[PDB]
Amino acid sequence: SSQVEHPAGGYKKLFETVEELSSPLTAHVTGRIPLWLTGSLLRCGPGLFEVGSEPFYHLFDGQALLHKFDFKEGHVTYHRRFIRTDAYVRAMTEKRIVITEFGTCAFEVTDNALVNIYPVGEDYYACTETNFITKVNPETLETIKQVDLCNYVSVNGATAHPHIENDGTVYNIGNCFIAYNIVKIPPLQADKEDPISKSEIVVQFPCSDRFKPSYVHSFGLTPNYIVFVETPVKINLFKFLSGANYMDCFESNETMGVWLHIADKKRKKYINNKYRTSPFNLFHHINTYEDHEFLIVDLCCWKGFEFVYNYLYLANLRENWEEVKKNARKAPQPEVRRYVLPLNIDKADTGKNLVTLPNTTATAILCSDETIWLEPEVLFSGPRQAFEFPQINYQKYGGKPYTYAYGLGLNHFVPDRLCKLNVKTKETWVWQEPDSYPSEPIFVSHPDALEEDDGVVLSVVVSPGAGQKPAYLLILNAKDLSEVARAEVEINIPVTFHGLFKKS
Amino acid sequence: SSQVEHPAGGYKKLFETVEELSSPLTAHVTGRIPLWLTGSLLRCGPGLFEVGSEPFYHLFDGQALLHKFDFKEGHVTYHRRFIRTDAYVRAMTEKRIVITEFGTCAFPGVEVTDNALVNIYPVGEDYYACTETNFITKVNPETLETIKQVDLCNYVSVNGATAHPHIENDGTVYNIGNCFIAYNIVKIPPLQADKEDPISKSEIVVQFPCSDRFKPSYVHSFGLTPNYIVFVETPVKINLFKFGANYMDCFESNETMGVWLHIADKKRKKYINNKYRTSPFNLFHHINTYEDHEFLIVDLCCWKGFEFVYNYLYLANLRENWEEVKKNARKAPQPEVRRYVLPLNIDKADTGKNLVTLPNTTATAILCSDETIWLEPEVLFSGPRQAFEFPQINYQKYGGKPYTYAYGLGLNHFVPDRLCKLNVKTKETWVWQEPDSYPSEPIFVSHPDALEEDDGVVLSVVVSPGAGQKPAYLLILNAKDLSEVARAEVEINIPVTFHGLFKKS
């Protein structure tokens, strides 16, 4: 949890427009940047929160800004460029808001790729959650091209959280007009042709409502299984095809709770196991893995069926601290939960707990109607203290048994700390300084590491305190979240959502 | 959690018949028995697990045995007598099982068991051993002699009452019982100047409704604050149609209803029509209930699932070897300490939102369009088949009020093998544990000059069947850190005990 109030209101600098740079700046290093840390921290976020006098209203509306911290021989540079999307280009051309954003109507689907960036073959794509992804140059931060996924596969959109296997295979999920389709983009072959042109639907998940698909932000992947969590946050397609924005089309199903779904990855087949539990919002899967014919499903949950995005309008996030805390009082409560999904359902065990694993308090009750009612093991819970934007040692422990998760700590939705969670012991570590607003921590392994947490986490920190530089790149030891170094920059950095470390 | 396996199988001594004593034994003290500790630890449990060749099958079948540890000037005595119930007396007379027990049918109208093996509580100047039926047994707390059988049906409209009545500081007794369908709160007043039996002044103050017209839920305990009564209606139902059958045969699980929580106004004696709903669990023990700015804080010892946990408490299963005991518990409901927060002020304008605006909890209450209030708990403690059970607090000063500390018996796949302290604010835990040592419910006794909530000791009866030890002992831990203060060792075995009290003298 946080041990800090924010009466000075410095967090408002997260949602303040910035200018892009023409070339990279030098970042003043204090401490020692590890000499094995060679590459680029690439991160996406909103950078432009108004077009002249026309404001953007929601956190997910601001125009995509691609950030880069370069590391080499203990030196750090910072660079940022706005992504030349249709949304941005046409806004600069017409000097107004042309494309409708998530929570801002224009008076044409948005390609404002402000959420994440991920590799496909030798290429990198900035993305939002629509059919449009933007190819970008990871060295120059130049916009290369717009890609429409609808040209290649049957999906109306795809999440900003595709899973990436070690061979370079990309998995993602998207709504299809109703079902949810898993897209598979293969690795780059010898022919050297665009892997997106070889895209295909491998498996389809069914929908709880014939005309209303659930909002899906992420999904789980193991070597053998795909996990999809269908939440009570529904998209109303009747309202969708009608001065409306995307937010206007969301509603909450009060009765359905949460439906969990598993598919066989290798046999490309949906499994008809009716996993059921109480209602929550879900944005981020932490990790999924297999343990003796059980799926371990670690989730960042929000307890309630009301859409958490309702609390992320810029007007509310820009209020003074006492008003920010009051606004969050009736919001869903954040909670890290472990669900255990049994793969072997024997009818003879009807009415009993199927979770026979010795190291969990998670339960799965087989009912007479063949629904499997799940109760979670709670890994972390703090009052309006969200362990969010979860990261692991993905390359080695993604989809596999693991111990450690890293997270951005939200204090009534304000990011004010970095967190480490041992998911076996439930022990936590916290890094926190006053009036300091960090980003998602990204784990980088020591290249010769045998241990899970042998490396560093990188976070971009906004520090608007009068006796400090506006922002800095923070490097913590992954072991205990003890500070290793900072790279301070002389310009402000807005909020960033997701990114990756590109090793060079 | 426990850090110990039990391959030696010493826990079998919990379920082994013992003989009563004619007079108290001396208990060999090691350490220092507090000199301010003056009175009697009275505890109830099964003592006779067979009548000749006829066995009792369930944990709650063995014949009531009343235990007493007396403390005075740093010295300890131990005494035990079987309660002379109809069940016990007629069993000794006919040399067979005469009365049907919870999980044991008797073979030659309906003769209900008065086997008071569960708890003992004060009413006026009297003490009553009880089970969960209409029959409670008046006992002499000094001699452990059986005085009388009392039928609650002679006084108030209930078919039974729990072994967990709440007792206010003035001596007022509250309890809950099924009535053929509703659940009735019984109020027994304090002893008046006229000096007449307070039970003859018993009355029903408020009635809770039933989810099923013909099937009442099993109720083991309930919550009480200065202003409110809290009742938790679980999916464990009693089938009155089915009611050579025993009590266990009549229980079934409602798969769809989950848990319904109910509040009544204590002082206005009126049921509040707030439809609190959550996921299915078994509930035996409320920890404590209190009021916080028009919210009820409801701390519960839960079992996650709708299957009846009592299904796992047959003596044949509890007497198996350790690896088989652990295997048997694998598919059982998982124990979990949960805090539920019940909003008292429901505004329709907050429909679809979390009503729990308290700043120090992650518990939620969602107001739905059908006016049901869906609850999610704050989990205070969770360990794999590691139950924090038989909860106790500083009851006299913090019962029904804001509090920090609970004490518990730790169950390891249903085997009691440790004592636990839980800070319900910080979720910090303390554990006392020795190998091949099987403790009882810890009972808190305050230091007479206590300033803090946990200024005192907990008393536990420990079965230690290890060859290089005496069979059993009275354990005294410091309530602060559960550090050992003293033991009073006895040279005879003690079976499992469920509940009791410290009677100050």
Ligand SMILES: NCC[C@@H](O)c1ccc(F)c(OCC2CCCCC2)c1
């Ligand atoms: N990252 C938080 C949300 C943000 O990225 C966002 C921006 C714009 C959106 F349109 C959007 O809705 C996704 C829909 C796209 C059409 C099919 C149904 C889902 C989400």
Ligand SMILES: NCC[C@@H](O)c1ccc(F)c(OCC2CCCCC2)c1
């Ligand atoms: N504490 C463990 C249970 C044990 O004390 C026990 C023994 C005997 C019982 F008959 C019994 O059932 C209670 C019923 C009594 C009739 C009305 C409906 C509830 C419970």
Ligand SMILES: CCCCCCCCCCCCCCCC(=O)O
């Ligand atoms: C660094 C962000 C701070 C501002 C408020 C953040 C609230 C996050 C709520 C839960 C996660 C929702 C998804 C956000 C990231 C994404 O779009 O992928």
Ligand SMILES: CCCCCCCCCCCCCCCC(=O)O
């Ligand atoms: C000291 C007890 C050990 C034997 C097994 C105990 C299992 C208890 C399960 C949960 C509590 C059920 C109620 C038992 C006490 C009572 O009858 O009041």
Ligand SMILES: [Fe+2]
């Ligand atoms: Fe995300």
Ligand SMILES: [Fe+2]
């Ligand atoms: Fe009990």
Ligand code: NA
């Ligand atoms: Na600090």
Ligand code: NA
């Ligand atoms: Na020990």
